[PDB]
C-alpha cells in the first residue's frame, strides 16, 4: 500500500512520466487490490482526465489502466457484501452523465457493472440488458456510428454471461446486429479491428454458456456472414469493400485461442472450425451452379457462380492455416460430397481447388499411411484421381491448371501405383510454370515428395522425361543517419509473394 | 436507483405530470411556468390535445395542494 | 453385369406385362433377387462394389424401381418371403444398444446406417409392412423407442455421423403414422434445457418436414396444449413459418393453408395477446402474427375476411393495450402496411400517449427519447411501404408542429421515395388530403406539400393540378392567415407551372406581376413567393423573349425474414 | 487566374477545423499505408513488358516492315 500511495501521488503532486506510471499500474492493478477500493473517485476522475490530453501514448496508457482498474473493482464489488457503495455512487450516474472513446468507456463500465447486478437486483440484469438492446438498435438503424459497436458487443456479452434466463425475443435482433457488425468489419482502423474481433470472440464465449441456443445462433450467424461476404462482387473482364479483407479476421478468429484464454481468465476454436465447416458445406450443397453454352461458358445463375468463386478463394485462404485435426472427420465425408459435386459438373476449377486444399490438409496430418473409413477414402481417392488424370487431356488452362494442381497435390500413398497417370500432368505443370509460378512451385514440391517416398527404381523410366522439361527456369540471368528509432523498420515486414529466383 | 438499478435519462401534459411527481424536493419550478406547456397543449389543433391538457390542469390542483405548493 | 441384369428384369416386368410373366417364371430360381437384396442391404455383396461414384449412387434408385416392379408382380410373395428371410426389422432392436451415438465405434454405426438406408429404400418402394410386422397400435416402437433412447441418453455428446444417423431414424419414424402425436407429446416435455425443445433444436428441419403432413392436426393439438406452455409452441410455430417461407419452390400455398388453419383455431389459445400473458409472451405472439401476416394471404385477411377480425381486433387490442412497451408499440406500427376508424382511434391514443407535443421535450440520449425516435422511424418505414393517405395526414399533423424535433430529413426522404412510388391517382389522393387539411399553417404546406410535389409523377401532377386550376385562380385573391394561404398557393403553383404548361396563363401572369411589384415580413415573403411563381411561369411563357421587363440472396432474405430484420 | 475561387472556398475550414484537419490527415495516412502495401505487392510482380514494332493486321502477312522494325528487337 505504500507503493500504491506513491503511485497515487505520482499522478498529481501539483514530459510523460505519469504515462509510465499508468502503464505500471495497469500491469499490476491486481497486485494492489484490496487497498485500491478506497480513494476510488480520485482515481476514476484522474484517469478520465488523463485519457483526454495530448501525447496519445498518455491517452492509451490511461485507457488501459482505467479498464484494468474497472475490471479489478468489478471483481471485488462482485465479491463484496458491502457492494453498494462503489456501484451506486459512481457507475450508473457517471456513465449516464457521459452522454469519443468516453462513450466506449461508459459502455464498458455498464458491462462490468452488470456483475454485481446478479448479486443484488438480478432483475436489473435483464433490465439493463434490454435497454442496451434498445440502445444498440437505435444506433443500428442510423447512418462514426461503428467506432462503438465492439464496446456494445463486449458489454452485452458480459451481461449475458451474468444473465441466466435470457429474453429470447431479442435473440434474432442481437444476432442480426452481430452479423451486420461483422459485415462492417472493413472501414475499420486496425487497433479497433482487433477490438472488434475481441468483442466477437467474447460474445461467442458468452453465448457458449447456453448450449442449444449457442449452437443455433452460431450456425445462423456464420451462415449469414458467409452469405454477406461471398455476395461481394469481384471484377470481371466511401470505397467498395471486397471479400479479400475479411480473411485475416477469420484467420485470427479461428486461431484466437491465445486471447480467448485470457478472456476466460477474467475447445472454442474447435467449435468455431466445426460450425464453419458445416455451414460452408451446407452452402455448397445449396449452391445453384447451372450453366450452358448459350467449350462455351454461359451460367444460368451468374450471381451464384460469382459468390461461389469468392467463397472458394476465401476458404482457400482460410483453411490450411489451422489444424486438419479438427477437419479430420470431414476428410472422408466432406470431400466425398464435394466429389459428388465435381462428378456432377466437372467443368469448375473451384471444385478442384477445394479438392486440392482438402488433400493438402489430409497430408498435413497423414490421414492415410499404407479402419474401413480409411480404406474407403483411400480407394475413393485412387479411383477419382485416376478419372481426373485421364480426363485432364480434355481441358485448357484456367480450368486445367487447377485440376493438375489438385492431381499433383495428391500424397505419395495414392500415387504409389500408375505413375503413368501422373507423368504427363507433371510435365505440363512444369511447362506452364514458365508463365504461372505457383503451379510450378507446388509441382516441384510434389516431385520432391514422390522422389523421397517412392523407390527411385520405378521413377527411373521417366527421370529421362521429367528432367528435360526442367531446362526451363534456367535460361537467363527517411533513411538518414539521424536516430529516428527507425519506425520504418518498426512498422512490419511486408507480406510474402513468390519469385522465379527462389 | 444510483446502483443495482437506475431511472431513465441520458412538458405539456404527461411530462408535466412527471415533473410534478419529481417535485418531492424543494417544491419548486416545473409547476410555476411549466403550466405554460399545458397551455401550449391547449392550442386545440387536435381533440385529445385539449382534453388531455384540461385533464392535466385538473390533476395539477391536487398535485400542487399535496406538494405544499 | 449385376446392374445390366437387374435393368433387364425391370424391363421384363414393366415393358412385358404378366402376359410374359411365364417367361419371367422361366427364372425358376429367384436367387438373382436374393443377391440383389443382399446388395440392397450391403452393396458390397457383389464384391467390393466400392468407389463411391455415380454408378453406385444410381444403384439404389433403380434397385427400388425393381422392388416396385416385383411388387406389382405376383412374385412379390417370393420377394417378401425372401425379403422376410433376410430380415424382419428385428436386428435394429438389438442394434440400438451397441454403445453408439459417439466415437465409441464406427462399424456399429455403419451397419445401423446401412439397415436404416435399406429400410428407407423399402419404404420408398412401398414395402412398409411386408418387412415390418405391423404393430397393432398406430405407434411403431421399432423406430420411435430407439430414437427416444438415443436422443435422451447420448447427451447427459454426439457426432455429425450421429447427426445423420439420428436424422435417418427420424425419417424412418415418419415412415409410419401414429408416431406424429407421440412426437407431439415428447417435444411437449418440460423435462438446464427442455429435452423436447432440445430435440427440436437438434432436427428442426426434419420435425418441420413431418409436421407439414399434419398441416392442421398437430398444429391444432399443440396450440390447444399451448395454454400452459408458450415459448416452445411459439418456437415450433415459428419453425413452421420459416419452413413455409422456404417451402415456396413447390408452392407457398402450404403456408397459406397452415396460416388459414391456425387462424380458424386462433381462439383456442387466448391466454395471450392481452393483459393476460407476460410482456415477453405478448411480444412473442406479436412476432408470430407478424410472420403470419408476412406469410399469410394479403389479398385477404387485410379487411374483413372470415377469421380476420378475431385477430385484427386482437391486433387492435394490442394497439389498445397501454401496458405494452413503446418499443412493442413501434413493432406493431411496423405491421400497419398489412392494413377502420378504430385504427385511427388507437393511432391517436398512442401518438398522444408517447409524444404529447414535441420530441425536443425529450432530451437526446434518454432511452425514452431514443425509443421515441426508433418508433417514428418505424412509422416512417411502415408508411413508406404502405403509402396510405391515412398515416400520411396522421404523421403530417405529428410533425408539422415544430421545425426539426423528430429528424424531419427522414420524413422528407420517405416522402420523396413514395412520391415516385404509388399509383398516380393514389398520389393525387394523398396530395388532396394534405391540401384540404391546409385550409404554423405554413408548416403543413412546407414540410409536406412541396416535398411530394417535387418528386410526384408528372401524370399524377396533371390530375392533381387539373383539380385545383381555377380553385387556385380564385383563391389567389387575420390577413396573416390569408397571406400564408397565398404563400402555400405560390409555393405549389411555381413548381406546378415550371413542370409543364389551357390558355389561362395571362391571367396569372398579371396576378403575379402585380403581386410582386406591390409597393410584417409577410409582405416581403409574399413578394418573393409570388416572384418565384412568376419566374416559374415565365420559364414556360415569354421564355422565348425577354423576361417581361441469386440463390444466396434468397437465403439471406429468408434468414432476414426468419429473424424479421432488414 | 481562375483557381482564386477554389482557394477562396478551400480556406472555409477556418471555423477551427485544425483538429479535424489532423483527423483527416491521419485517416488518409492509414489509407495511404494500405495503398502502399498494395503498391509494393504489385511491384513485387515482374514489371510489364515493352515491345518494339508496329503491326498492321490483314488477311495476309505484311512484308513491308522496316529495318528499324527488323533490328530494334
Curated annotation (Swiss-Prot), chain A:
DNA-PK is a heterotrimer of PRKDC and the Ku dimer (composed of XRCC6/Ku70 and XRCC5/Ku86). Formation of this complex may be promoted by interaction with ILF3. Component of the core long-range non-homologous end joining (NHEJ) complex (also named DNA-PK complex) composed of PRKDC, LIG4, XRCC4, XRCC6/Ku70, XRCC5/Ku86 and NHEJ1/XLF. Additional component of the NHEJ complex includes PAXX. Following autophosphorylation, PRKDC dissociates from DNA. Interacts with DNA-PKcs-interacting protein (KIP) with the region upstream the kinase domain. Autophosphorylated at two clusters, the T2609 cluster and the S2056 cluster. Autophosphorylation induces a conformational change that leads to remodeling of the DNA-PK complex, requisite for efficient end processing and DNA repair. HEAT repeats lie at residues 38-73. The modification Phosphoserine is found at residue 493. The modification N6-acetyllysine is found at residue 480. It is linked to Immunodeficiency 26 with or without neurologic abnormalities: A form of severe combined immunodeficiency characterized by reduced or absent T and B cells, recurrent candidiasis, and lower respiratory tract infections. Some patients show dysmorphic features, severe growth failure, microcephaly, seizures, and impaired neurological functions. It is found in: Nucleus; Nucleus, Nucleolus; Cytoplasm, Cytosol. Belongs to the PI3/PI4-kinase family. This is DNA-dependent protein kinase catalytic subunit. The chain holds residues 244 to 850 of 4128 of the full protein.
UniProtKB/Swiss-Prot annotation, chain B:
Disulfide bonds: none annotated. Induction: In osteoblasts, by FGF2. It is found in: Nucleus; Nucleus, Nucleolus; Chromosome. ADP-ribosylated by PARP3. Phosphorylated on serine residues. Phosphorylation by PRKDC may enhance helicase activity. The modification Phosphoserine is found at residues 7, 9-10. Single-stranded DNA-dependent ATP-dependent helicase that plays a key role in DNA non-homologous end joining (NHEJ) by recruiting DNA-PK to DNA. Required for double-strand break repair and V(D)J recombination. Also has a role in chromosome translocation. The DNA helicase II complex binds preferentially to fork-like ends of double-stranded DNA in a cell cycle-dependent manner. It works in the 3'-5' direction. During NHEJ, the XRCC5-XRRC6 dimer performs the recognition step: it recognizes and binds to the broken ends of the DNA and protects them from further resection. Belongs to the ku80 family. The EEXXXDDL motif is required for the interaction with catalytic subunit PRKDC and its recruitment to sites of DNA damage. The VWFA domain interacts with the KBM (Ku-binding motif) found in a number of DNA repair proteins. Heterodimer composed of XRCC5/Ku80 and XRCC6/Ku70; heterodimerization stabilizes XRCC5 protein. Component of the core long-range non-homologous end joining (NHEJ) complex (also named DNA-PK complex) composed of PRKDC, LIG4, XRCC4, XRCC6/Ku70, XRCC5/Ku86 and NHEJ1/XLF. Additional component of the NHEJ complex includes PAXX. Following autophosphorylation, PRKDC dissociates from DNA, leading to formation of the short-range NHEJ complex, composed of LIG4, XRCC4, XRCC6/Ku70, XRCC5/Ku86 and NHEJ1/XLF. (Microbial infection) Interacts with human T-cell leukemia virus 1/HTLV-1 protein HBZ. This is X-ray repair cross-complementing protein 5. It comes from Homo sapiens.
Swiss-Prot record, chain C:
TPR repeats lie at residues 356-389. It is found in: Nucleus; Nucleus, Nucleolus; Cytoplasm, Cytosol. Autophosphorylated at two clusters, the T2609 cluster and the S2056 cluster. Autophosphorylation induces a conformational change that leads to remodeling of the DNA-PK complex, requisite for efficient end processing and DNA repair. S-nitrosylated by GAPDH. Residues 158-191 are annotated as: Leucine-zipper. Residues 158-191 are annotated as: Interaction with C1D. It comes from the Eukaryota. Belongs to the PI3/PI4-kinase family. DNA-PK is a heterotrimer of PRKDC and the Ku dimer (composed of XRCC6/Ku70 and XRCC5/Ku86). Formation of this complex may be promoted by interaction with ILF3. Component of the core long-range non-homologous end joining (NHEJ) complex (also named DNA-PK complex) composed of PRKDC, LIG4, XRCC4, XRCC6/Ku70, XRCC5/Ku86 and NHEJ1/XLF. Additional component of the NHEJ complex includes PAXX. Following autophosphorylation, PRKDC dissociates from DNA. Interacts with DNA-PKcs-interacting protein (KIP) with the region upstream the kinase domain. It is linked to Immunodeficiency 26 with or without neurologic abnormalities: A form of severe combined immunodeficiency characterized by reduced or absent T and B cells, recurrent candidiasis, and lower respiratory tract infections. Some patients show dysmorphic features, severe growth failure, microcephaly, seizures, and impaired neurological functions. This is DNA-dependent protein kinase catalytic subunit. It comes from Homo sapiens. The gene is PRKDC.
Amino acid at each position: 500500500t505504500s507503493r500504491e500511495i506513491f503511485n497515487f501521488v505520482l499522478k498529481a503532486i501539483r514530459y510523460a512520466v505519469p504515462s509510465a506510471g499508468l502503464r505500471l499500474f495497469a500491469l499490476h492493478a491486481s497486485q494492489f487490490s484490496t487497498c485500491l477500493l478506497d480513494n476510488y473517485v480520485s482515481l476514476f476522475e484522474v484517469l478520465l482526465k488523463w485519457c483526454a490530453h495530448t501525447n496519445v501514448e498518455l491517452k492509451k496508457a490511461a485507457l488501459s489502466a482505467l479498464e484494468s482498474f474497472l475490471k479489478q473493482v468489478s471483481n471485488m464489488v462482485a465479491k463484496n457484501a458491502e457492494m453498494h457503495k462503489n456501484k451506486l455512487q459512481y457507475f450508473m450516474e457517471q456513465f449516464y452523465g457521459i452522454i469519443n472513446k468516453e462513450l466506449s468507456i461508459a459502455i464498458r463500465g455498464y458491462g462490468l457493472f452488470a456483475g454485481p447486478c446478479k448479486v443484488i437486483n438480478a432483475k436489473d440484469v435483464d433490465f439493463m440488458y434490454v435497454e442496451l438492446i434498445q440502445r444498440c438498435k437505435q444506433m443500428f438503424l442510423t447512418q462514426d456510428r461503428v467506432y462503438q459497436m465492439p464496446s456494445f458487443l463486449q458489454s452485452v456479452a458480459s451481461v449475458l454471461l451474468y444473465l441466466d434466463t435470457v429474453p429470447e425475443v431479442y435473440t434474432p435482433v442481437l444476432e442480426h446486429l452481430v452479423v451486420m457488425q461483422i459485415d462492417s468489419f472493413p472501414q475499420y482502423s486496425p487497433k479497433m479491428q482487433l477490438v472488434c474481433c475481441r468483442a466477437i470472440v467474447k460474445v461467442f464465449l458468452a453465448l457458449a454458456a447456453k448450449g442449444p441456443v449457442l449452437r443455433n445462433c452460431i450456425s445462423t450467424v456464420v451462415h449469414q456472414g458467409l452469405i454477406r461476404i461471398c455476395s461481394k462482387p469481384v471484377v470481371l473482364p466511401w470505397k467498395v469493400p471486397t471479400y479479400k479483407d475479411y480473411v485475416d479476421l477469420f484467420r485470427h478468429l479461428l486461431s484466437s485461442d491465445q486471447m480467448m484464454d485470457s478472456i476466460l481468465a477474467d475447445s472454442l476454436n474447435h467449435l468455431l472450425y466445426d460450425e464453419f465447416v458445416k455451414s460452408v458445406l451446407k452452402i455448397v450443397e445449396k449452391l445453384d451452379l447451372t450453366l450452358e453454352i448459350q467449350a462455351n461458358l454461359h451460367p444460368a445463375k451468374p450471381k451464384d457462380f460469382s459468390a461461389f468463386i469468392n467463397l472458394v478463394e476465401f476458404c482457400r485462404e482460410i483453411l490450411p492455416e489451422k489444424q486438419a485435426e479438427f477437419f479430420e472427420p470431414w476428410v472422408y465425408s466432406f470431400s466425398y460430397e464435394l466429389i459428388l459435386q465435381s462428378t456432377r459438373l466437372p467443368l469448375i476449377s473451384g471444385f478442384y481447388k477445394l479438392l486440392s486444399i482438402t488433400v493438402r490438409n489430409a497430408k498435413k496430418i497423414k490421414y492415410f499411411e499404407g479402419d474401413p473409413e480409411k480404406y474407403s477414402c483411400f480407394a475413393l481417392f485412387v479411383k477419382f484421381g485416376k478419372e481426373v488424370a485421364v480426363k485432364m487431356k480434355q481441358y485448357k488452362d484456367e480450368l486445367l491448371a487447377s485440376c493438375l494442381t489438385f492431381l499433383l497435390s495428391l500424397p505419395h500413398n495414392i500415387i504409389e501405383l500408375d505413375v503413368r497417370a501422373y507423368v504427363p500432368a507433371l510435365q505440363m505443370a512444369f511447362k506452364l510454370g514458365l508463365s504461372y509460378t505457383p503451379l510450378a512451385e507446388v509441382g516441384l514440391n510434389a516431385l520432391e515428395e514422390w522422389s523421397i517416398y517412392i523407390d527411385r527404381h520405378v521413377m527411373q523410366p521417366y527421370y529421362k522425361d521429367i528432367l528435360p522439361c526442367l531446362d526451363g527456369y534456367l535460361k537467363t540471368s527517411f533513411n538518414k543517419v539521424v536516430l529516428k528509432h527507425l519506425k520504418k523498420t518498426k512498422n512490419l515486414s511486408s507480406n510474402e509473394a513468390i519469385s522465379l529466383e527462389e | 436507483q444510483g446502483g443495482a438499478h437506475f431511472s431513465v435519462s441520458s412538458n405539456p401534459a404527461e411530462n408535466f405530470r412527471v415533473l410534478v411527481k419529481q417535485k418531492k424536493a424543494s417544491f419548486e419550478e416545473a409547476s410555476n411556468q411549466l403550466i405554460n406547456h399545458i397551455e401550449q397543449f391547449l392550442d386545440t389543433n387536435e381533440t385529445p390535445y385539449f382534453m388531455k391538457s384540461i385533464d392535466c390542469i385538473r390533476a395539477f390542483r391536487e398535485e400542487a395542494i399535496k406538494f405544499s405548493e | 453385369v449385376v446392374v445390366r441384369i437387374m435393368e433387364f428384369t425391370t424391363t421384363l416386368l414393366n415393358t412385358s406385362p404378366e402376359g410374359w410373366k411365364l417367361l419371367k417364371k422361366d427364372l425358376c430360381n429367384t436367387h438373382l433377387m436374393r443377391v440383389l437384396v443382399q446388395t440392397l442391404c450391403e452393396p458390397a455383396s457383389i464384391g467390393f462394389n466400392i468407389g463411391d461414384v455415380q454408378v453406385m449412387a444410381h444403384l439404389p434408385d433403380v434397385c427400388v424401381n425393381l422392388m416396385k416392379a416385383l411388387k406389382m408382380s405376383p412374385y412379390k410373395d417370393i420377394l417378401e418371403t425372401h425379403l422376410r428371410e433376410k430380415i424382419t426389422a428385428q436386428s435394429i432392436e438389438e442394434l440400438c444398444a451397441v454403445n453408439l451415438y459417439g466415437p465409441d465405434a464406427q462399424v456399429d454405426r455403419s451397419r445401423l446406417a446401412a439397415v436404416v438406408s435399406a429400410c428407407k429404400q423399402l419404404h420408398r418402394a412401398g414395402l412398409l409392412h411386408n418387412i415390418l410386422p405391423s404393430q397393432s397400435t398406430d405407434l411403431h416402437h421399432s423406430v420411435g423407442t430407439e430414437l427416444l433412447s438415443l436422443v435422451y441418453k447420448g447427451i447427459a455428446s454426439l457426432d455429425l455421423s450421429c447427426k445423420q444417423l439420428a436424422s435417418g431414424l427420424l425419417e424412418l419414424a415418419f415412415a409410419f403414422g401414429g408416431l406424429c402425436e407421440r412426437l407431439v407429446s415428447l417435444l411437449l416435455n418440460p423435462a438446464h434445457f427442455s429435452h423436447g425443445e432440445y430435440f427440436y433444436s437438434l432436427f428442426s428441419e426434419t420435425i418441420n418436414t413431418e409436421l407439414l403432413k399434419n398441416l392442421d392436426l398437430a398444429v391444432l393439438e399443440l396450440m390447444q396444449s399451448s395454454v400452459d406452455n408458450t415459448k416452445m409452441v411459439s418456437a415450433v410455430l415459428n419453425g413452421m413459418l420459416d419452413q413455409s417461407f422456404r417451402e415456396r419452390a413447390n408452392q407457398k400455398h402450404q403456408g397459406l393453408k397452415l396460416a388459414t388453419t391456425i387462424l380458424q383455431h386462433w381462439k383456442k389459445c387466448d391466454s395471450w395477446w392481452a393483459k393476460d400473458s407476460p410482456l415477453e409472451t405478448k411480444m412473442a405472439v406479436l412476432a408470430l402474427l407478424a410472420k403470419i401476416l408476412q406469410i399469410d394471404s394479403s389479398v385477404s385477411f387485410n379487411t374483413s375476411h372470415g377469421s380476420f377480425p378475431e385477430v385484427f381486433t386482437t391486433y387492435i387490442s394490442l394497439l389498445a393495450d397501454t401496458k405494452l412497451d413503446l418499443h412493442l408499440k413501434g413493432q406493431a406500427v411496423t405491421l400497419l402496411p398489412f392494413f377502420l376508424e378504430e385504427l385511427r382511434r388507437v393511432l391517436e391514443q398512442l401518438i398522444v400517449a408517447h409524444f404529447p407535443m414535441q420530441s425536443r421535450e425529450f432530451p437526446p440520449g434518454t432511452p425514452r427519447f431514443n425509443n421515441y425516435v426508433d418508433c417514428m422511424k418505424k412509422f416512417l418505414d411502415a408508411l413508406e411501404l404502405s403509402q396510405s393517405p391515412m398515416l400520411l395526414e396522421l404523421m403530417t399533423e405529428v410533425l408539422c408542429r415544430e421545425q426539426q424535433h423528430v429528424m424531419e430529413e427522414l420524413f422528407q426522404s420517405s416522402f420523396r421515395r413514395i412520391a415516385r412510388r404509388g399509383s398516380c391517382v393514389t398520389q393525387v389522393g394523398l396530395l388532396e388530403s394534405v391540401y384540404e387539411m391546409f385550409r404554423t399553417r405554413q408548416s403543413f404546406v412546407d414540410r409536406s406539400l412541396l416535398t411530394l410535389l417535387w418528386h410526384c409523377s408528372l401524370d399524377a401532377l396533371r390530375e392533381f393540378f387539373s383539380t385545383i386550376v381555377v380553385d387556385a385562380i380564385d383563391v389567389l385573391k387575420t390577413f396573416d392567415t390569408q397571406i400564408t394561404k397565398k404563400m402555400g398557393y405560390y409555393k405549389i403553383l411555381d413548381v406546378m407551372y415550371s413542370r409543364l404548361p389551357n390558355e389561362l396563363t395571362k391571367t396569372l401572369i398579371k396576378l403575379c406581376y402585380d403581386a410582386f411589384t406591390e409597393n410584417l415580413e409577410r409582405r416581403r415573403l409574399y413578394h418573393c413567393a409570388a416572384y418565384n411563381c412568376a419566374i416559374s411561369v415565365i420559364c414556360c411563357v415569354f421564355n422565348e423573349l425577354k423576361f417581361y421587363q441469386s440463390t444466396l440472396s434468397e437465403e439471406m432474405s429468408q434468414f432476414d425474414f426468419s429473424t424479421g430484420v432488414q | 487566374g481562375r483557381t482564386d475561387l477554389l482557394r477562396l472556398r478551400r480556406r472555409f475550414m477556418r471555423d477551427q477545423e485544425k483538429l479535424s484537419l489532423m483527423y483527416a490527415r491521419k485517416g488518409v495516412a492509414e489509407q495511404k499505408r494500405e495503398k502502399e502495401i498494395k503498391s509494393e505487392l504489385k511491384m513485387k510482380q515482374d514489371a510489364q513488358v515493352v515491345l518494339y514494332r508496329s503491326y498492321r493486321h490483314g488477311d495476309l502477312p505484311d512484308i513491308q516492315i522496316k529495318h528499324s522494325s527488323l533490328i530494334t528487337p
